[PDB]
Design a protein around this ligand. Sequence first.
Ligand SMILES: N=C(N)c1ccc(/C=N/OCC(=O)O)cc1
Ligand SMILES: [Ca+2]
Length: 223
Amino acid sequence: IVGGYTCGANTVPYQVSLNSGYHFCGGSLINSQWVVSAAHCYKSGIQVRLGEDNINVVEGNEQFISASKSIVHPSYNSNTLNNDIMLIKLKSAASLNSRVASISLPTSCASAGTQCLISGWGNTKSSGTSYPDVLKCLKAPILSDSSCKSAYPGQITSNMFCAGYLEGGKDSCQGDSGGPVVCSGKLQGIVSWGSGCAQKNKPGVYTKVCNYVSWIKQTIASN
Ligand SMILES: N=C(N)c1ccc(/C=N/OCC(=O)O)cc1
Ligand SMILES: [Ca+2]
């Protein structure tokens, strides 16, 4: 997260870190045994880390649970990043409490102008590299589809939306991939892509979760 703020320990209780020996992506806990992340985050050997603040220090509220299975969206295209969504099942159910909590799926899509909270342990610089150890937060509005399409001609599908600031300086970034965009207590987006980070006229692009609610529910119900 570039140009954001320190969230505060366990203030984003649905935020997970995906760990394969090191943090490589964020995700969102949607019930006691399932996480939503980005398909581009796919790999084998995932351990889901819940209740994290400092990802380099055991602080006392963590739950570390290995994934039993990952399910990449059947229509995910890694070239275009269309359908950039994946579900990860935990080998055992997380213990839910105020610091480890699921986030609701949307009942309807959110509109341009809606303020959302985007979070992750990704790069905090728009040029060069600095990875924070504690969770970073950004409040950002959803942008109009017209401004999103104008920023990225030929690249925005119906399964994507832009959020952030066309002036630049405030954005998600590498390492935030797969993490949440939450608006009015609903998971509306997944950190997916963007040209660099926090660049002028290159806002963040997010997977449009409201399009996937049926797939998520039916997948969970049978797996
Ligand atoms: N909002 C952005 N500008 C943005 C967000 C996410 C990315 C993801 N890159 O993938 C590499 C990784 O995280 O492992 C790029 C740009
Ligand atoms: Ca920790």
